[PDB]
Amino acid sequence: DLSSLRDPAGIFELVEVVGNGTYGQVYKGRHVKTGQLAAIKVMDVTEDEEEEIKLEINMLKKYSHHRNIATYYGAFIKKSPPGHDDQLWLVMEFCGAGSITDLVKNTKGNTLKEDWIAYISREILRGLAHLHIHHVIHRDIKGQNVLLTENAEVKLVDFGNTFIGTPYWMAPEVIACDENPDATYDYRSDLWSCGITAIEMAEGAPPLCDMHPMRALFLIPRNPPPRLKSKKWSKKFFSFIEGCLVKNYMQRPSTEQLLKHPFIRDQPNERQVRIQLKDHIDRT
Ligand SMILES: Nc1ncc(-c2ccc(C3(C(=O)O)CCCC3)cc2)cc1-c1ccc(Cl)cc1
Numbered sequence: 001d002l003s004s005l006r007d008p009a010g011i012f013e014l015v016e017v018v019g020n021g022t023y024g025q026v027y028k029g030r031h032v033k034t035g036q037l038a039a040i041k042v043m044d045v046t047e048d049e050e051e052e053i054k055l056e057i058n059m060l061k062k063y064s065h066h067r068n069i070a071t072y073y074g075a076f077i078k079k080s081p082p083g084h085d086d087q088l089w090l091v092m093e094f095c096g097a098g099s100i101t102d103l104v105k106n107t108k109g110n111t112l113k114e115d116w117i118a119y120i121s122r123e124i125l126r127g128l129a130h131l132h133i134h135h136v137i138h139r140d141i142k143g144q145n146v147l148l149t150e151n152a153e154v155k156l157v158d159f160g161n162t163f164i165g166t167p168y169w170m171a172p173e174v175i176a177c178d179e180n181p182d183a184t185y186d187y188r189s190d191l192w193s194c195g196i197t198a199i200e201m202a203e204g205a206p207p208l209c210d211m212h213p214m215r216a217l218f219l220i221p222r223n224p225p226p227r228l229k230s231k232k233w234s235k236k237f238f239s240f241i242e243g244c245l246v247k248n249y250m251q252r253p254s255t256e257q258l259l260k261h262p263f264i265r266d267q268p269n270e271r272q273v274r275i276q277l278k279d280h281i282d283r284t
Contacts, residue, residue: 005076006076006077008076010032012038013030015029023041023158025042028040028094038093041090056090057072063131063136066127068127071093072092073093075090096149099145100120100200103148109204113273114202114234115269115272116273117198117202118237121198121264131156139159142168142193142206143201148281150281152277166213167217168208169196169197170193172221172249173189177221188249188253192244196245199226199241
């Protein structure tokens, strides 16, 4: 019941729009009493959307209580005059260091160290494993939706209607064509997306970045699986990319199987990498 939701008036304060417009009306927010920061997603509410939004709050409520998923705090309604429209504020954990895309763009040559890719990939997989256990498909895994805190903690955001978004991280099965008329999301679609996010960390951009989004959407189901440009990478990393990017989702490994991959499993400098990331964040 949305009637139970309070006005954010002396509770949460909006500071500024965060990212740019990558996430839309997502704001850096402040808890008025403690000054503690939060991420505030603002959306207009109509009487028809009352049960369409009730499930999005419930989704955040139920599944964000994992260390690799940005935690739900609460929900508020900023009422409008009788001539509409009400505003719903979804208050979340603030991942102050921004996204993985920001991290790659803020690194010289726009590439990340292989041990940094492995660490962040495992945190993506651990967050996806939690969602998949609960029978939830993220549906939008990409660098922009993988966030960092000040402590180099990796957290997932925006898990799941009018616009088709960016195609570059979309698995072949989610794109409708003549052989695949009913483009379906499988849990394994998040794994393809994870592999594209791993190329994005390695190369600074996803595989068909130079193509018009319409051309990329056409090519993803027809082209062979994308590959890393450089040969500098280890055998373990190419194998992980190959594992994520199995063209036919029916032979693609599960999240549990990818968590057992040597590239994700074998991480000795796990504590060292976390420090290096924290240090890179400190250089704002
Ligand atoms: N939970 C979050 N915590 C933090 C952010 C966030 C994103 C970007 C920035 C930067 C900025 O300050 O502009 C830092 C430097 C350049 C980017 C800062 C903070 C976003 C969300 C969030 C994402 C998606 C959704 Cl759907 C809801 C919330």
